[PDB]
């Protein structure tokens, strides 16, 4: 019944080794017993075969294999070598035929003449034989073929050094990864049109990057440098120390650091360190750097674009466009120039030129154009921008200023900048000699390949991922298997093995235990984790099948046995120690410097004991190497490793110390050290970035420097764009769907405590990720605007869970030290930890009501101000057990918490004896302690001085005589005790209960004020009591005799002294004793105000006040006294009680804003009332410009607007008054009530205080406590406002 019909199928297909990606093949060789690159230095067939080839990629890592034999031959009748590579099953494809084994064709010498243009061991090489000649390049070369030093301090050692140095012989070239000066002299030659790219030099001496002298006509020229820059005794951009050269249309765009405490001269600048010649110039010529100096002395000269300029040296049409950043401002620090002033007898007219110079630098501690300002300054023109040339000026609180040595611009430097309109080249890349990829895009047939689908390209660019090493026949075999719905179909950046999220990279160790899951990553930032078992006992090539998918999975290594390596190499490398010379050659650093600033005491033994396991997971990743029985690589890679043994673990101790913590049970030190793919570039490999990490030099490894350390160097390793967009990234793939705030809070072990404020709408805004409003810790410490983002790795990598605490709020992020609280009545254990932890989160509680209030009062959209981030650091003095003793401990001490923390983060603190101190955008405690209640009053007195410029005002400066403590202490601070008497607003702290005698302040501020009229309420309130007493005690004093008259009022006066700027305008309170004529004039109540009278009791001086002092009003003190200074500034004490009078009569944005924050300037400068400070014009604001502009017209002077007040509170009382007064007054054989009903009772006791108080005068060291007035005084204040609930209301009015 049924005919056979057969049936076609396909054919099977052999499966083999290939390397379809190649860039370029390099040819090694062990002649001399070491191992050397040849390049084309095969000149004649080699007898012997000792060579071994290492093949590059760009797709994945290089794939050294030895090599089988050579011989010469003719691809196209051109004498080339037949290398021919070797490997177990390895496979070569060329024009769909098979070769058995991997050839390439090495040609022998080119014809190129005139100059060496191959590489830079020739070039190099070819310069040192003869130092004169001319040498172009040929092709984009790197620097490290160079073996770099025995001792030497540069690559070309000779005095003549490469006469004519072209660098375009059709194009451009390039020279990459130089790391130290390029010639050491240059004398007569003609540097031209070279590009250093990525320069990381080093050096004890003047270090630059294409010199370090320029003895004759050095004519420099299109030469454009860049990379980082570390120095000891000079820098320069392109030569340290040029004479009679002219560095013309050349340019540097890098970092340069010299923060070494040397006390020597050195004179570093951005471009040229010194130019000393009548002929030298600096023409067209740009410098984009970031310098952070140390300069300590008037000898060390920072410079900018050039360092000290001698001898009639010009500077034309040059430009620098970074972020100078000097420590102290000491030393002659300068925008464009550090000095241009001669070293010997300097005559002036041997000085220093410029002509059209700008400068768009942020300047810190230095001058904006020349750090050293002259009579016969010889500048002659200068350009700038508005910025940062802050200059730390040191009050009782440190502050920033301005230096004033400048020649202004505004924005228009978009266009003033392109005066030099070069804008690019075109430098060239490496080059590459190949590619012998199978899938040619040319279409012979409409399929690549027998059998290729050109939907599926994406599919096979994803199994090239999967399997490497394979033949492109089975990458397109599984290409077609892969399931249509299967997820392959995007692309694939290289996926990693976890072992149930371990990571593991020693394939050869853990092959045979299955590799239980595989995390693929995608290109959309999504993950997926597949499961495979280790399927088939390839052994060349490690096979796992994936779970379900039909496909299979082959890790990216060979299986290669590392055991004679690492048995070979650790004896070598387990005799280091970190205080031994080796370390001290391999990093470029004297004998003077110390490494503590490195804080790799102890991880340096951790990986020296554990070094076996990380060298062996090292090699797995580091290349691949295909051999069975001979050792002609393996000698390589020990070589290798012995010859840099030293930077080796000193590399691996850094990555590992500095990243340590992991996502999710993931090391991130797996991920870093190792798996240099996660983010695609798998051309690097791991091994080479540890070595060339630990080479970097001391300032690179520093740990203050990671983040910079990362983005400049173990950047372009990865693929990443910077250290916490890795970060990012590495949570984004493992530990998905979870805000990197919590990542960071649940891998911190700082007890981290954040408080978002209680107003709804702020607490919405601040718990959402996105930035700029959120409240997490790791959104603020990795965002720009954050000086210390050094801060972060420190804190994920923290040992011991109980030694940092952190408190965030809005408008700060404040860090301090378990250790720092402990004492003998708090152990390190179980008692500490409480105390600490309840504490934190009482002080978060209250500064959040700090800012809380804060953001009620502000309306003018300067709420949204208050979303910054200044830092609170602790004291540093750590305590101990024994005694109750602090040590202050700043640096190079064995204290955990400093090794661990506030060291790696690069602050160094001041240190000042007593109290808190602010530096304008951080502040610090050094005697009183975040934590206690005393902290939350000391916290608001310094962020008044921090946020007093802009937040707090409406963004107008402080007034022109009013110095920063005017603020604080007397206006907007809150009191230290509820009990204190003076005039103040509570906005911390919250009283229970306890302090409800005796109270005198608002208990509640949370409930207090909800708005700015609550707080003018408030106010008015108050001072509507205070006015009252005032009255009262007012006509008690008028109608009293001469001598006790005298004794109790004194008057106070406005003298002017000079500022030390030019004025003499602001003025100073000065409390004398008055006139018998002026006490026979007062004769009633508005006789008291005419005559400017103040009251003795409370203020106890009798002498002048002081300006910048911490003066407080109080309640019960009368001053009479309008005090308008119609010259300029009031002064610090009726300054202080005017503000507060204009709050209570006008609002807080409408009065008591202009009163005290220069809102008028441009008003009084319209009007004529304008000033020089410190060589600006600036307006003046007299007070009778603010009389004017707060109220219209209605008021003529001060002493009217008071007289008003005046009047206005005795219409209200003189009929109506709360009869709920009840204070009883006495505390023993006391009235049971006073029981005020009519105003009549409280002027008859306060009249019969005054008079009773005049005779019996107490003028003694306690005017406080025997005093009938104050008490009474105090009396009725408190039974007012225990009345009132605080201060709504005083006398009720309609009825």
């Known amino acids: 019944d049924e005919k056979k019909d057969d049936i076609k199928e396909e054919k099977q297909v052999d499966k083999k080794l290939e390397l379809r990606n190649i860039s370029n093949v390099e040819l090694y060789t062990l002649e001399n017993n070491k191992y050397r690159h040849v390049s084309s230095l095969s000149s004649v067939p080699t007898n012997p075969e000792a060579y071994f080839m290492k093949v590059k990629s760009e797709n994945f890592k290089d794939v050294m294999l030895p090599v ?78 160079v073996e770099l030093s025995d001792g030497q301090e540069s690559y070309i050692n000779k005095e003549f050094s490469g006469k004519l140095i072209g660098e375009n012989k059709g194009k451009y070239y390039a020279i990459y990864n130089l790391k130290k000066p390029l010639f050491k ?39 454009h440098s860049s990379g980082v820059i570390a120095g000891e005794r000079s820098i320069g951009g392109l030569i340290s120390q040029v004479t009679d050269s002219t560095i013309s249309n050349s340019s540097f765009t890098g970092r340069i650091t010299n923060t070494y405490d040397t006390t020597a001269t050195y004179q570093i600048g951005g471009l040229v360190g010194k130019l000393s010649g009548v002929g030298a110039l600096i023409e067209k010529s740009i410098s984009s750097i970031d310098m952070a100096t140390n300069a300590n002395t008037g000898d060390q000269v920072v410079g900018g674009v050039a360092g000290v300029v001698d001898k009639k040296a010009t500077i034309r049409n040059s430009y620098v466009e970074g972020n100078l950043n000097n420590v102290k401002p000491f030393g002659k620090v300068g925008g464009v120039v550090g000095n241009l002033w001669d070293r010997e007898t300097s005559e002036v007219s041997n000085s220093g030129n410029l002509t059209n110079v700008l400068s768009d630098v942020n300047v810190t501690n230095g001058n904006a154009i020349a750090g050293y300002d002259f009579n016969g300054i010889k500048a002659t023109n200068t350009y700038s921008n508005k910025n940062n040339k802050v200059v730390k000026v040191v009050q009782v609180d440190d502050e920033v200023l301005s230096k004033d040595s400048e020649e202004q611009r505004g924005t228009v430097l978009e266009n003033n900048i392109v005066l030099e309109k070069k804008i690019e080249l075109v430098p060239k890349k490496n080059t590459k000699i190949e590619d012998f990829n199978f899938s040619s895009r040319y279409e012979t047939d409409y399929k690549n390949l027998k059998d290729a689908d050109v939907s599926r390209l994406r599919v096979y660019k994803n199994i090239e991922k999967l399997l490497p090493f394979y033949n492109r026949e089975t990458i397109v075999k599984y290409g077609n298997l892969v399931d249509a719905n299967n997820t392959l179909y995007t692309k694939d950046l290289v996926s990693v093995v976890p072992m149930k999220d371990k990571e593991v990279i020693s394939d050869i160790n853990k092959n045979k235990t299955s590799i239980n899951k595989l995390l693929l990553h995608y290109s959309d930032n999504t993950s997926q984790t597949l499961d495979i078992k280790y399927l088939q006992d390839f052994s060349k090539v490690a096979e796992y099948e994936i779970a379900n998918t039909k496909l299979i999975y082959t890790p990216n290594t060979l299986l290669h046995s590392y055991n004679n390596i690492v048995k070979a190499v650790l004896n070598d490398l387990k005799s280091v120690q970190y205080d031994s010379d080796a370390v001290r050659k391999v990093l470029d650093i004297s004998s003077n410097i110390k490494l503590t600033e490195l804080y790799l005491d102890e991880q340096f033994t951790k990986t020296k004991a554990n070094i076996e396991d990380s060298l062996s997971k090292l090699l797995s990743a580091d290349a691949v190497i295909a051999e069975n029985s001979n050792s002609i690589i393996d000698n390589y890679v020990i070589e290798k490793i012995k010859n840099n043994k030293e930077a080796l673990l000193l590399g691996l101790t850094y990555l590992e110390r500095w990243y340590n913590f992991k996502y999710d049970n993931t090391s991130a030190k797996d991920l870093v050290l190792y798996h240099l793919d996660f983010f695609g570039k798998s051309n690097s490999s791991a091994l080479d970035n540890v070595i060339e990490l630990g080479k970097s030099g001391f300032n690179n490894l520093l740990a203050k420097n990671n983040v910079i350390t990362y983005n400049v160097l173990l950047s372009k390793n990865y693929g990443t764009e910077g250290l916490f967009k890795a970060l990012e990234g590495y949570r984004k793939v493992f530990l998905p769907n979870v805000s990197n705030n919590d990542w960071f809070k649940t891998q911190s072990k700082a007890y981290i405590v954040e408080e978002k404020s209680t107003i709804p709408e702020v607490s919405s805004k601040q718990s959402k990720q996105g930035t700029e409003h959120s409240i997490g810790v790791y959104d603020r410490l ?228 909800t708005n700015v009229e609550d707080l003018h309420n408030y106010m008015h309130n108050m001072f509507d009591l205070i006015y009252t007493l005032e009255i009262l005690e007012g006509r008690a004093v008028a109608k009293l005799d001469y001598n006790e008259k005298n004794d109790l009022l004194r008057k106070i006066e406005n003298i002017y002294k000079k500022d030390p700027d030019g004025n003499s305008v602001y003025a100073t309170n000065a409390v004398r004793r008055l006139t018998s004529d002026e006490i026979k004039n007062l004769t009633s109540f508005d006789k008291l105000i005419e005559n400017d009278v103040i009251t003795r009791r409370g203020y106890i001086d009798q002498g002048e006040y002081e300006r910048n002092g911490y003066h407080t009003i109080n309640l019960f003190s009368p001053i009479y006294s309008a005090l308008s200074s119609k010259i300029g500034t009031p002064g610090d004490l009726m300054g202080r009680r005017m503000a507060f009078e204009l709050l209570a009569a006008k609002g807080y944005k409408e009065g008591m804003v202009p009163y005290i924050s220069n809102q008028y300037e441009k008003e009084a400068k319209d009007r004529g009332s304008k000033i020089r400070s410190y060589g600006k014009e600036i307006g003046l604001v007299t007070d009778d410009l603010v009389l004017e502009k707060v109220f219209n017209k209605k008021y003529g002077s001060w002493v009217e607007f008071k007289k008003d007040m005046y009047k206005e509170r005795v219409e209200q009382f003189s009929k109506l008054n709360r009869v709920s007064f009840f204070d009883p007054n006495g505390p023993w054989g006391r009235q ?61 009015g309609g009825k």
């Open 68 to 145: 089988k034999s050579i011989e010469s031959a003719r691809k196209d009748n051109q004498d080339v070598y037949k290398i021919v590579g070797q490997a177990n099953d390895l496979i070569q494809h060329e024009n769909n035929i098979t070769l058995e084994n991997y050839t390439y064709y090495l040609p022998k010498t080119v014809n190129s003449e005139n100059g060496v243009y191959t590489s830079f061991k020739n070039l190099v090489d070819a310069m040192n034989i003869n130092p004169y000649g001319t040498f172009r390049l040929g092709a984009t070369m790197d620097a490290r073929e």
């Open 185 to 223: 002299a240059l004398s007569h030659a003609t540097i031209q049109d070279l590009s250093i790219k990525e320069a990381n030099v080093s050096s004890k001496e003047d270090a630059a990057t294409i010199a370090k002298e320029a003895k004759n006509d050095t004519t420099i020229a299109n030469v």
């Open 782 to 1009: 990795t965002s720009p605007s954050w000086k210390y983002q050094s801060m972060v790795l420190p804190l994920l990598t923290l040992p011991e869970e109980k030694m940092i605490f952190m408190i965030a709020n809005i408008s700060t992020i404040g860090f301090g030290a378990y250790d720092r609280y402990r004492s003998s009545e708090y152990p390190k254990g179980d008692k500490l930890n409480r105390f600490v932890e309840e504490n934190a989160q009482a002080a978060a509680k209250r500064f959040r009501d700090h800012y809380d209030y804060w953001y009620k009062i502000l309306d003018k959209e300067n709420k949204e101000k208050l979303f910054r981030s200044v830092l609170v650091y602790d004291a540093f003095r750590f305590g101990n057990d024994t005694n109750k003793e602090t040590q202050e401990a700043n640096f190079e001490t064995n204290n955990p918490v400093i090794k661990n923390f506030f060291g790696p983060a690069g602050n160094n603190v001041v240190h000042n004896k007593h109290g808190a101190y602010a530096t304008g955008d951080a502040f610090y405690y050094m005697a009183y302690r975040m934590l206690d209640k005393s902290g939350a009053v000391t916290y608001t007195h310094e962020m008044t001085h921090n946020s007093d410029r802009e937040i707090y005002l409406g963004g107008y400066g402080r007034r022109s005589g009013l110095g920063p403590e005017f603020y604080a202490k007397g206006l907007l601070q809150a009191p230290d005790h509820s009990y204190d008497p003076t005039i103040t607003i509570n906005s911390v702290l919250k009283y229970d209960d306890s302090e409800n005698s005796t109270r005198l302040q608002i208990a509640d501020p949370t409930q207090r004020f």
């Open 1232 to 1292: 049971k009530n006073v029981t005020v009903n009519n105003i009549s009772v409280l002027e008859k006791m306060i009249e019969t205080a005054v008079r009773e108080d005049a005779e019996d005068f107490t003028a003694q060291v306690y005017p406080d406590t025997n005093s009938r007035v104050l008490k009474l005084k105090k009396a009725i204040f408190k039974a007012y406002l225990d009345q009132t609930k605080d201060f709504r209301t005083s006398i009720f």
